[PDB]
Structure formats: structure tokens, C-alpha cells
Design a protein around this nucleic acid. Structure first.
Ligand SMILES: [Mg+2]
Ligand SMILES: [Mg+2]
Ligand SMILES: [Mg+2]
Ligand SMILES: [Mg+2]
Ligand SMILES: [Mg+2]
Ligand SMILES: [Mg+2]
Ligand SMILES: [Mg+2]
Ligand SMILES: [Zn+2]
Lengths: 111, 121, 171, 60, 66
RNA sequence: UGGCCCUCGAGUGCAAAGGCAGAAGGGAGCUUGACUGCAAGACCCACCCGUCGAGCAGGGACGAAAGUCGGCCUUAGUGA
RNA sequence: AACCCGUCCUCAGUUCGGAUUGCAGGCUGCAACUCGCCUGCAUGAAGCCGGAAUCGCUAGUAAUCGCCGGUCAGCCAUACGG
């Protein structure tokens, strides 16, 4: 556990190493550095106070835990209520107007 | 599960089915409590105790003084007085019953001190 | 900051507190932790020695005490094993290690588990004893394990009251 | 013929002894498996001629 | 305890949190580093209910329009 | 792997019967008595075979010692 | 746009790859659930140049880069024609 209950590698840069966190994408990784206005150095070489200053600011977003829970309840909302989009999840099939005649190998494989 | 007192009694019976007190070689058994020692010399054929030596005897309670429990030095005194109490009765041979406890420790000092003079075992 | 927290916090604060909860007629009727048995079963331990000799050292650093190569009680072909071969990895924690281990449990390893929302309070067996299951051991700051806590409690209520005071976050 | 009867000879007895006590050599015979015991079989057993226990080893 | 067959376990091994000595425990390693110690984790400070319902969608309907 | 309850329902290399629970079952440490020279007295019984064995000397193992050991819990594993 | 200059990424399912899904929004339109196109975030599948087989191309061609248009309120166009 480097930060956020995940062991991040220590060789990569800072921008392209927070992205392994489940709640941090490519834009959020930049917004954090831009808010802290610090230079994108290595992961291991970073100071303690600066690295400490990251550990306090990252916790403001839906990083992990509630993020995966906020999604799973949302998909659970559609299943119990039996929307059209909810039944397709139960069927293991898409719900955004895709054609199902010759494609959708992702969900069919993920049965 | 089994407690210390229960396992102690089992270790004493497995010993007793081999050692047996007789007029020619009585049975010397020991009982150590959390605060006292105790010894008996028995002829099992007669079911009678010939001699004994306890921690509560006046001839030795005035001499020794322990706070928590009887030490190795105490056992050396019990083996000494019981020996002098045996030779006056006219018996030398004896079978050693270790009371279910291991031979190592204070039980060894009691046997050696008693074996140091007078007795044959 | 003190040396031993649980050992001192228990005798001074908890025993007057837990006695008032159930109103025991004697102080010796209070329950207390006897031991903590940490099991780790591997069926494929008979194949490799590196995975065996290494994992035995992994738990040792977590506990400060060597594990034990636990052997099979009987042979059976359903899982392709033989009698006398090692199947499980176990160890006994008593005295100060069980408290020092518990400090490393509630505060170091148990919080670092992914998606943590408290341990099941229904894991009691019905005689005061308690158990825990893990998938990983890297949560300890140094594969799974079955931690079996023993207690002298008759019912589970005083145990649940006992364990809850020493952290043990229950849902 | 996995199991076999093995012959044990005394290590210490000499041939054609000119002593007055007794002349000869001690020799026992026992069972011994080959695969379960590929090595030799030496044991300290009694020797009537040597008046003591001696290491009787396999003659072959 | 047998002599040569245990690690170098000790007592009062300190535990820093970015130089903050929250407390000390016994362990084999020299020191520790933690960020989920007691209070940083929400489940301890929280009610420990472990159950949320996503109360209502009417709030999404009414608050957004206003 | 932890605990609770019933207690001999397991196991004792193999067939069965009989026996064995702080055990004859299950482990650990040291060991070769799986000896030499005998043997009072018994069981069995057409004959020839077969079985148990106190105790004595010798030189030894284990045990602190008392004491135990002349192959295996017993009965088939053999040929004048 | 490919391209030139400069910083970083150094052979990794990766700063390759962008499927699938949730949330929050916009435009067209009487109407966007089945069944439109887009934005902002977060998720980050398979896939390491590909069997037996098989297609195109003989010069500004093949290969590769992007631009426009028609139908059209809007657009499932990665198409069609340039
Ligand atoms: Mg990410
Ligand atoms: Mg039976
Ligand atoms: Mg036995
Ligand atoms: Mg793959
Ligand atoms: Mg590659
Ligand atoms: Mg292809
Ligand atoms: Mg042509
Ligand atoms: Zn000889």
C-alpha cells in the first residue's frame, strides 16, 4: 500500500502511476499535480511532505470502496426494478443500442 | 481437556503396576503439593505405612524456611531424615515410586540425598 | 506509546468494566484470551519446497515465531494425498505474542484489506470462540489464513463484548 | 528373491587359534532385506569364544 | 523459547506515520509506516452500519430543475 | 485448524475368532536378548512331531533405580 | 494532417490498444426507452502481425496522411463519390 490501499510501482513517473488506482483516470492524474503545482518527478525520489500532501488531497474523490459500491448499486437498481437496460445486464448483453447479430463478443464471452 | 491433577493420577497408576512394596523392599512414594512435600514408606502386602517424612514435621519445620514453595534444598533434607527414620526400623532395600512426576528436578535430589547414605535403591 | 497496551489496558480498565456488564460473583469468572491459532492450508505443499520453505518464513515474520509443518491425519485419493505428508501450516500464539499479534491485526492488517466494511459478528461457534478468514497476508506490513482465537467464555455475548473492546470492528 | 537369509561372522575371531580356552569362530544367521537395507548389517552380539560381545558383520 | 529457531522478535517497535509516533508495538521489523491506522479509515469513525440505500431519486428530479 | 457433545462405536502389516483404552493401539530417545550353555515341572498325543516354562551361570542392552528382554498381541507363513 | 524542432515514455498488455458499463450534461427535433449524434469524468475486454487458404497493385501507382461534398431537422457515413 503506497497510497489509496494499492501498491503502486516506484519507477514510473507520478502522472502515469496514480492511474493504476481504480478511481484515477488520465485527467484526474493531471488535475492533482496542477492543483499542487509540483514538478512531475519520479515516484521514489519524491519527498515525504510533498508525498504527504498527495495523500490528503486524493481522498477527496470517490477513489476506491464507495466507487465500486456506487456502481454496483446502480446496476443493482436497474435489475430489481426491471428496466429494459436492467434485463440486458441479467442476460449478459449490452444496453446502449448495439446490434447483437454478429458482434458483442465481449459480453457473450463474459457469461 | 485433562487437567494437571488428572494427568498426574494417570502417571502414578502406570508406575504402580510395576513397583510393589514388600517386607523386603517396601515402596517409597512421594507427594509434592504447591506448598509442601510428603513421603511414605509402605509394605503393600500388609497395607501399612512403616515410616514417613513431611514438610510439616517439627524437627525440620524450624530448620528450613521457604516463602513460595519447597526448594531443592528442602528435598535434600526430606531424604536425609527419612533415611535415618528407616535405618532405625531395620530396613535398607526399598523401591522408589516417583509419584507420577518426572525424575528430573527436586525428585532427583530427594532420591540422591536418600541414596547418599543408608538406603539401597 | 506505552510498551504493552492490551496487557495493561485489559487488567486495569477492561476487567472492572466487563465485570460490571454481566455482574459476575467472582473476578475469576471473567473470560480472557487463551491463544490464537493461525492456520494456512496448502494442498500442493507436497510438490514444491521453495513455495513451502518460503511461505513458512513469511508467516514467521508476521508472528515472530516459526510455523509448524502440519501433517495429514489419514490418506485419501480424492485429493491425491498420502498419510504423514505435510498439508497445513500452523502456529500457536500465547502470552504477549497474542496481544502483540492482535495489535498488528486490528490496526495494521485488518484496515488494509481491500473494500473493508467490518468483520462478520456471526463467526462465533457458540462457545465463546471466534475465527477469521483471509485471502492475502501482504496486508501485514512485511496465501490466506484461518486465524482461530480461543477464549474461556461460555456464551458468545461476553466474547462479542470482550473482542469489541479490543478494536475488532464489527458491522 | 527380495528377502534373503544373511550370515554374520565375528570381527575379531582368528582362524586356527592355539589358545586353551576354546578354538573356533562365532557365526550367527538372520533375515535381511536387500532393498529396504542395501548396506551391510553389523551388530554387537555375543561370542562364546571371545568371552564378550563383538561386532558380527556380514561375511558376504 | 528455543534459541536459534525464531526470528529476532522484540517489544516496543515504534510505528511512525510520516514521522508521527502514534504508538508503539512489538514486532520483528525495525519500524512501520501506516496511513490506515485508526482514524484515517472511515469505517472506524463511522457508524459501522455497512448499509446505504441511495435514499431517493426524487432529489435528482427536483433539485436539478429547481 | 479451533471448540463442544457421545465414549472404545477406531486401530492393532494380511483371513477370521478371541484379546487389548492412561492399553497389546499411537509417538519420541537409546539400542540388538531377532543372545551363549542349560533346565525343575506341565499341556498335547497311535507313533514320528508340536507347545508353554519358573529358575541357574556367563557376558550385555535400556532404565536414576526397582526391574524387564532367550524376536514380533495370540493362533497359518511350512517338508521327516 | 502526415512532416520539422524540443521534453518524456524504453519493450511493458505498457503513457501500446479504447471495447464494455455507470454517473453528470449538450444539440436536433412535437417526439431521442426500444432506436440519434456528440461533451465531461471514471471503468480499461480481447489482441504480441495471425491456420489450411485467399485478395489488390506495373508509377505520382501501391502504401500512408488528412480535407470536401451529396442525400440530410438530426444521424447510427468506419459508407458512397471526389
Ligand atoms: Mg485509473
Ligand atoms: Mg472394533
Ligand atoms: Mg505402545
Ligand atoms: Mg491477453
Ligand atoms: Mg510487444
Ligand atoms: Mg488479419
Ligand atoms: Mg495494367
Ligand atoms: Zn569373537
Amino acid at each position: 500500500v503506497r497510497v489509496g490501499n494499492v501498491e503502486i510501482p516506484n519507477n514510473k513517473r507520478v502522472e502515469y502511476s496514480l492511474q493504476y488506482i481504480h478511481g484515477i483516470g488520465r485527467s484526474r492524474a493531471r488535475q492533482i499535480l496542477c492543483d499542487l503545482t509540483l514538478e512531475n518527478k519520479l515516484t521514489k525520489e519524491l519527498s515525504e511532505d510533498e508525498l504527504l500532501q498527495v495523500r490528503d488531497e486524493v481522498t477527496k474523490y470517490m477513489i476506491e470502496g464507495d466507487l465500486r459500491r456506487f456502481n454496483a448499486i446502480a446496476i443493482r437498481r436497474l435489475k430489481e426494478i426491471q428496466c429494459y437496460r436492467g434485463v440486458r445486464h441479467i442476460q449478459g448483453l449490452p444496453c446502449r443500442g448495439q446490434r447483437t447479430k454478429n458482434n458483442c463478443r465481449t459480453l457473450k464471452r463474459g457469461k | 481437556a485433562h487437567t494437571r491433577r488428572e494427568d498426574r493420577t494417570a502417571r502414578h497408576v502406570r508406575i504402580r503396576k510395576k513397583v510393589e512394596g514388600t517386607p523386603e523392599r517396601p515402596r517409597l512414594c512421594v507427594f509434592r503439593s504447591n506448598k509442601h512435600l510428603y513421603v511414605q514408606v509402605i509394605d503393600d502386602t500388609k497395607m501399612h505405612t512403616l515410616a514417613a517424612a513431611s514438610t510439616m514435621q517439627k524437627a525440620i519445620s524450624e530448620n528450613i524456611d521457604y516463602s513460595a514453595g519447597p526448594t531443592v534444598e528442602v528435598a535434600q533434607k526430606i531424604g536425609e531424615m527419612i533415611a535415618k527414620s528407616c535405618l532405625e526400623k531395620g530396613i535398607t532395600k526399598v523401591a522408589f515410586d516417583r509419584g507420577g512426576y518426572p525424575y528430573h528436578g527436586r525428585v532427583k535430589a530427594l532420591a540422591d540425598a536418600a541414596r547418599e547414605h543408608g538406603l539401597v535403591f | 506509546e506505552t510498551i504493552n497496551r492490551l496487557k495493561t489496558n485489559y487488567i486495569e480498565k477492561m476487567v472492572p468494566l466487563l465485570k460490571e456488564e454481566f455482574s459476575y460473583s467472582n473476578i475469576l469468572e471473567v473470560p480472557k484470551v487463551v491463544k490464537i491459532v493461525v492456520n494456512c492450508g496448502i494442498g500442493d505443499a507436497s510438490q514444491n519446497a521453495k513455495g513451502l520453505d518460503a511461505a513458512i518464513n513469511e508467516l514467521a515474520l508476521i508472528t515472530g515465531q516459526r510455523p509448524v509443518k502440519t501433517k495429514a491425519k489419514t490418506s485419501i485419493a480424492g485429493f491425491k494425498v498420502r498419510e504423514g505428508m505435510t498439508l497445513g501450516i500452523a502456529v500457536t500464539l500465547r502470552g504477549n505474542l497474542m496481544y502483540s499479534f492482535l495489535d498488528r491485526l486490528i490496526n495494521l492488517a485488518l484496515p488494509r484489506t481491500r473494500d473493508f466494511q467490518g468483520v462478520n459478528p456471526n463467526s462465533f461457534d457458540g462457545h465463546g470462540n471466534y475465527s477469521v478468514g483471509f485471502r492475502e497476508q501482504s496486508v501485514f506490513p512485511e496465501r490466506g489464513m484461518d486465524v482461530c482465537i480461543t477464549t474461556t467464555a461460555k456464551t458468545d455475548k461476553e466474547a462479542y463484548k470482550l473482542l469489541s473492546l479490543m478494536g475488532m470492528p464489527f458491522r | 528373491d527380495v528377502r534373503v537369509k544373511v550370515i554374520l561372522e565375528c570381527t575379531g575371531c582368528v582362524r586356527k587359534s592355539v589358545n586353551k580356552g576354546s578354538r573356533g569362530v562365532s557365526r550367527y544367521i538372520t533375515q535381511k532385506n536387500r532393498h529396504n537395507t542395501p548396506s551391510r548389517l553389523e551388530l554387537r552380539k555375543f561370542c562364546p569364544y571371545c568371552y564378550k560381545h563383538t561386532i558380527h558383520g556380514e561375511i558376504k | 523459547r528455543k534459541s536459534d529457531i525464531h526470528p529476532e522478535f522484540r517489544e516496543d517497535a515504534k510505528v511512525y506515520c510520516n514521522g508521527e509516533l502514534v504508538m508503539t508495538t512489538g514486532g520483528t521489523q525495525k519500524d512501520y509506516t501506516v496511513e490506515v491506522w485508526s482514524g484515517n479509515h472511515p469505517f472506524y469513525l463511522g457508524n459501522r452500519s455497512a448499509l446505504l440505500l441511495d435514499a431517493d431519486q426524487v432529489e435528482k428530479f427536483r433539485k436539478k430543475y429547481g
